[PDB]
Amino acid sequence: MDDGRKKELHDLNTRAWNGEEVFPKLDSSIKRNTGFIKKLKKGFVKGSESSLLKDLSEASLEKYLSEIIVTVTECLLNVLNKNDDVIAAVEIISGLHQRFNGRFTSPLLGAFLQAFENPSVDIESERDELQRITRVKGNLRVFTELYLVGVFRTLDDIESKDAIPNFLQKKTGRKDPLLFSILREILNYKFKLGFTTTIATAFIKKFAPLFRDDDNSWDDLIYDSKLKGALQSLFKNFIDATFARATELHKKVNKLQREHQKCQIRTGKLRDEYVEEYDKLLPIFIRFKTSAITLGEFFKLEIPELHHHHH
Numbered sequence: 001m002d003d004g005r006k007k008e009l010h011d012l013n014t015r016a017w018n019g020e021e022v023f024p025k026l027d028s029s030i031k032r033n034t035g036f037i038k039k040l041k042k043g044f045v046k047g048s049e050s051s052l053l054k055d056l057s058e059a060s061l062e063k064y065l066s067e068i069i070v071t072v073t074e075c076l077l078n079v080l081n082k083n084d085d086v087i088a089a090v091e092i093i094s095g096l097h098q099r100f101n102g103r104f105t106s107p108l109l110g111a112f113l114q115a116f117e118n119p120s121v122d123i124e125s126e127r128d129e130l131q132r133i134t135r136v137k138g139n140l141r142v143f144t145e146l147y148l149v150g151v152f153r154t155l156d157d158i159e160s161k162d163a164i165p166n167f168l169q170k171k172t173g174r175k176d177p178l179l180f181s182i183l184r185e186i187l188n189y190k191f192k193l194g195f196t197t198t199i200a201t202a203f204i205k206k207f208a209p210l211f212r213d214d215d216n217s218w219d220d221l222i223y224d225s226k227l228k229g230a231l232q233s234l235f236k237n238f239i240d241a242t243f244a245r246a247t248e249l250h251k252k253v254n255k256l257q258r259e260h261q262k263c264q265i266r267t268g269k270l271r272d273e274y275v276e277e278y279d280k281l282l283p284i285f286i287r288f289k290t291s292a293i294t295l296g297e298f299f300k301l302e303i304p305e306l307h308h309h310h311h
Ligand SMILES: [Cl-]
Pocket: 153, 177, 178, 179, 222, 223, 224, 225, 227
């Protein structure tokens, strides 16, 4: 999907939010409507969009709306990390939004945002944490693509009736852009372990125009003009933190390595207390260093000294 098609959908989706019927007797039969749900349940993958769009132009799905919302919520949260599948999901959600506006999109958005609430427990398995982070990144990607086409815009679109996650509740006065709110939450779960730094790098790589002031290509797609500024502030703070932690870890791993090496010269032993602690810290250091380098390259900044010769 090119920027032209994004803008086409944005215009249609904005009109739908504005109360227009922009989507052009309907079939209200049980067979037709359950047949639609079954099609949704096969998942949002490439090509599946066109068939579903035909149903939206032929079927009267109003009495199955609640079920469609739940079904789509599950499908959306489980979209694969495949660029073509994401595009299909965007076209399908846009169609549904154009047919039903807020009575579909409001509860969908509220339920979808639950995907960004941080766990309220500690990490038990870093293997599981990597899987969790992968899921969050996929959910963030899909959210952002739907933001850019004007489907998912702001908490202000959600009805009071429709629940929103705890981390987004009780907002008064000036609200931050929704993407800022989401990223401030997800970047800050167990930050010191370094797994969330990969959310930051994945996000800037895929959505670069949000981070480059000279890049105006998505300005017409952005809901609140403060977004680019807010995101730049958030990420520059995150970079300061990432650089600082990388430097702290760099000093620790080098110190432990040096003591281990001196020990091995003295005694000939392969193992000692220094390399045992080193082994626990090194993967964390590597996560921070890799991310420090990527963030530095993207924002054209020099990295702190992070030399380390390992293995
Ligand atoms: Cl915004």
